Symmetry: C3
Subunit: 138 residues, 3 copies
C-alpha cells in the first residue's frame, strides 16, 4: 500500500519578510563546516495564491560540505492532525530524502522524498516534493 | 570494501515489542536537570533554541520505580520541538540494545521509532506520549512503545 | 513478507579526525559546565575502501553528533563511487568509536534501507582515529 500523496511544495525561505528559518551557528573558517539552521518550512498541496497549507517541515539542517536535514513533516490537515512523517537526508533543494518513520495515520512509514526546484524568489524558493511512501497501517 | 547483495524477504511482524508503562523524566531545571539549551531563539524569527537532553526513563511511577534507560539526544524548537535521540537501555536483560526515536512534540503527541541496535535491530514503530505528572522542575511523560522487529 | 535485497558492506573505514591539518569536524556549541552536556560537533567524516596506499574515497559521513552523557549520532552516508554516486544511508545511533549504529533509511540504490551498522576501532592516530564499519541492512525491491 503506497500513500496516495499529491505533490507537495516546501517553502524554503532563508531570509526576507517571510523568513521561516534561522542560523544558530556559523561556519568555522579553518574547516569550512558547522553552520546549523533551524527551519519551520511551510508545505502546500499545490501552487498559486489559493494553494492551502497542509503540513510543516519542522527541524534543522547542518552544513558539513552539504546540508544534512532532519525534520518532522507534521500535517496541519483536519483529518490528519497529529500524524507526522519523519524525514532525514542530504541536500535541501535537489536530491532525495528518506522517510525514516511516521506517526498516527503514517505509523511505521517508510519511503523516499524526491526534491525538485520549482520557483526561485527574491528571498526564498519553492521545492517540489514527490513522496513514495509505504505504511503497513492495513 | 565489499558489498554483498542477497535477495530475501522481510517479516514485518517478526518480533513485536510492547513495553508499556514507561515514564520519561523531562527536567529542564533544578538540581536534577537532565538537559541544557545550547542556542537561543532568534528574536526576529522566533526559533532556533537547540536543547541537548539526557532524559532518564523509569519503569514506573513512585518510589519503587527503577531507572531502565536514558533518552540521549537533542530537540530543537522550530515552532515546535523536533526530537532526535537514542533510547539506550541500561537494564541487564537489554544492555546495549537501543531504540532510535524521532518525532515532534515532547509533552504529548506521538514519536516515531525509526530504528534500533542490538536486540532492537531494524525496529520500526511509534511511541505514544501522555502527560503523567507536572512537577516543579519539570514533568514526567508516560511513554507507550508499539514497535516490531522485522525478521530478515 | 516484503521482497527485497539484503545489503552487506564490509571493510569500510571512517576517518574521525577531531584535530590536525586533516580535521573533518568542528564543535559549534560548548558543553554546559553546570549540567555536563551540550557539545555539538558537525562532522564530514570520509569513508574509504581500505587502509593506507591509494585507498579510494567511497563515501562521506555528513551530519552531526551531540554530547548528552554520550554521543548521539545522526548523519547521511553519501557515497562518492561512480556506481553509488548520490545514494545515501541515513544513520542514527550512540557512540562513535565503538558500539552499534542503526540504519533508519536511505536514498538512491538504498531506498527504504533498514538495518544496523557495526563499528570497530582500527588505527588510533595522534590527530584522530579510523573506525571500521560493517553494514547489515535490508532494502525492499524497488
Ligand atoms: O540548502 C539549505 C541552505 O540553502 C542555502 O542556499 C540558498 C537557496 O536555498 C538556494 O536555492 C540558492 O540556490 O542559493 C541560496 C544560497 O546562495 C541558503 O542560503 C541557506 O539559508 C540554507 O537554507
Ligand atoms: O519540550 C521541551 C521544552 O519544553 C519547554 O516547556 C516547559 C515544560 O516542558 C512544559 O511542560 C511546560 O508546559 O512549559 C515549560 C516552559 O514554560 C521547556 O521550557 C524547554 O526547556 C524544553 O525542555
Ligand atoms: O565522539 C565524538 C568526540 O570524540 C572525541 O574522541 C576522542 C578520542 O577519539 C576518544 O577515544 C576519547 O574517548 O575521547 C577523545 C576526546 O576526549 C573527539 O576528540 C571529539 O572531537 C569528538 O569527535
Amino acid at each position: 500500500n503506497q500513500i496516495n500523496f499529491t505533490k507537495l511544495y516546501l517553502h524554503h525561505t532563508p531570509a526576507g519578510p517571510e523568513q521561516n528559518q534561522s542560523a544558530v551557528t556559523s561556519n568555522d573558517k579553518k574547516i569550512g563546516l558547522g553552520c546549523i539552521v533551524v527551519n519551520n518550512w511551510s508545505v502546500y498541496d499545490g501552487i498559486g495564491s489559493d494553494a492551502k497549507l497542509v503540513a510543516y517541515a519542522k527541524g534543522l539542517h547542518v552544513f558539513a560540505g552539504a546540508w544534512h536535514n532532519s525534520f518532522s513533516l507534521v500535517f496541519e490537515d483536519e483529518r490528519l492532525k497529529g500524524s507526522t512523517l519523519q524525514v532525514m537526508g542530504l541536500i535541501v533543494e535537489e536530491g532525495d530524502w528518506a522517510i525514516v518513520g511516521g506517526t498516527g495515520q503514517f505509523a511505521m512509514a517508510t519511503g523516499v522524498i524526491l526534491k525538485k526546484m520549482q520557483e526561485q524568489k527574491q528571498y526564498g524558493n519553492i521545492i517540489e516534493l514527490t513522496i513514495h511512501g509505504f505504511c503497513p497501517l492495513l
